[PDB]
Amino acid sequence: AQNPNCNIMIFHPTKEEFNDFDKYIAYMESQGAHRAGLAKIIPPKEWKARETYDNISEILIATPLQQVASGRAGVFTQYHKKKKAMTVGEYRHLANSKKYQTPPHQNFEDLERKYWKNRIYNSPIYGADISGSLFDENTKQWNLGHLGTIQDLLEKECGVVIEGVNTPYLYFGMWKTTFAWHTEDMDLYSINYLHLGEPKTWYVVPPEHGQRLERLARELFPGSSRGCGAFLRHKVALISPTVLKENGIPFNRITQEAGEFMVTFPYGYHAGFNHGFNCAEAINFATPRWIDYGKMASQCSCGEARVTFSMDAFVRILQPERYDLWKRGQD
């Protein structure tokens, strides 16, 4: 069995290996990369996403979100307060202001210590889930707007044609912006490219151990757990590495830098934070190996999770027994 300790693997594809996306995902899996829940892919030196980032300032962040925390430094929830619209140039200036800028630090480990000590005492502002792409149309390799769609994958594997679309999303971050513990919708894969700026630190639980994280979360967030049998789908709960280690939960950590891709694998729980002003692009995707995970994915039906149009068909076809309850939670 490849990668039996479930370590995060780092890959360096050549330009020839970078041509065929599906083939390379399958290669990484042949080496056991999915056992970690997360892998890093460093593009060949010949590749670029686009020519420059000099002309992105006029992109609009229609609904910036202020992430307000409640709890204790290592075990907290966050809610998102909507703010007035602003451009990427305005948001960059805000991220660099004395109130929001990254503090002085020695190295990534010192900054990680500072994040977990101090996060709750501040409310950073995140531009999230902005439909769009920063890949040049002429970039033919690993262009996150030109991937095979999940609807086409389901149709290829199962024979059923379904409605829905699959497009990428942009994220603009600042110091302390936070992504809560979650798996993807329908336990899909994700891919994330860090286009520019400061790093992103990730934490991940191996898929084979995801239910250990779920049981700890029910203990640590007991009101939320009574409210909903899949409350991590709400994407609001944070648990620090120190608390995970105290409770024996298997996990790993890695820092992504600009120019690097990360892939999350089906049912890989992940969380993390941004180091300073940055911009990332991410999208969900599927492979044949995903179908079994889609069939078994938990679902929130309490009303909180609310998701895209295209998840309807995935539930309806893969989880017909659950469909009527889930759709009620959508309405």
Ligand X SMILES: O=C(O)CNC(=O)C(=O)O
Pair 90, 216: CB distance under 8 Å? no
Q: Which stretch binds Mg ion (CB under 5 A): 46-54, 57-65, 251-259, 289-297?
A: 57-65
- Closer Cβ to Zn ion, 60 or 228, answer by number: 228
Question: What Cα–Cα distance (Å) separates residue 4 from each residue in 27, 93, 203, 259?
Answer: 17, 45, 18, 29
Q: Which of residues 265-284 bind ligand X (CB under 6 A)?
A: 280, 282
Question: How many of the chain's residues bind ligand X (CB under 6 A)?
Answer: 8
Q: Which residue has the tokens 């603009």?
A: 172
Please identify which residue in 304, 307, 308, 319 interacts with Zn ion, judged by CB under 5 A. Answer: 304
We find the least distance from the C-beta atom of residue 61 to Mg ion, in angstroms, to be: 12
Q: Which of residues 281-300 bind ligand X (CB under 6 A)?
A: 282
Tell me: is residue 200 an annotated ligand-binding position.
Answer: yes
Is 189 near ligand X (CB under 6 A)?
no
Other Cβ atoms closer than 10 A to 166: 19
Angle between helix 320-330 and helix 311-318 axes, rounded to 10 deg: 150
Tokens of 289: 């190996």
User: Which amino acid makes up residue 262?
Assistant: M
We find the least distance from the C-beta atom of residue 33 to ligand X, in angstroms, to be: 16
Tell me: is residue 146 an annotated ligand-binding position.
Answer: no
Tell me: is residue 12 an annotated ligand-binding position.
Answer: no
Q: Which residue has the tokens 């809610």?
A: 79
Q: Which stretch binds Ni ion (CB under 5 A): 126-134, 189-197, 245-253, 308-316?
A: 189-197
- Closer Cβ to ligand X, 13 or 197, answer by number: 197
The number of angstroms, rounded, from the C-alpha of 52 to the middle of its chain's C-alpha atoms is 25
**69/76 Cα distance (integer angstroms):** 6
We find the least distance from the C-beta atom of residue 199 to ligand X, in angstroms, to be: 11
Is 111 near Zn ion (CB under 5 A)?
no
Question: What Cα–Cα distance (Å) separates residue 232 from each residue in 115, 251, 260?
Answer: 22, 17, 27
Is 171 near ligand X (CB under 6 A)?
yes
**277/269 Cα distance (integer angstroms):** 24
Tell me: is residue 118 an annotated ligand-binding position.
Answer: no
How would you classify residue 6: left for phi > 0, otherwise alpha for psi between -120 and 50, otherwise beta?
Answer: left
- Closer Cβ to Mg ion, 75 or 196, answer by number: 196
* Beta strand pairing call for 269-274 and 252-256: unpaired
Pair 177, 249: CB distance under 8 Å? no
Q: Which does residue 58 touch among Mg ion, Ni ion, ligand X, none (CB within 5 to 8 A, set by kind)?
A: Mg ion
Contact residues: Ni ion, CB under 5 A: 190
Contact residues: Zn ion, CB under 5 A: 228, 300, 302, 304
Instruction: Tell me the binding residues.
Output: 126, 182, 184, 192, 200, 228, 234-235, 270, 300, 302
Contact residues: ligand X, CB under 6 A: 171, 179, 190, 192, 200, 264, 280, 282
Instruction: Tell me the binding residues for 2-oxoglutarate.
Output: 126, 192, 200, 235
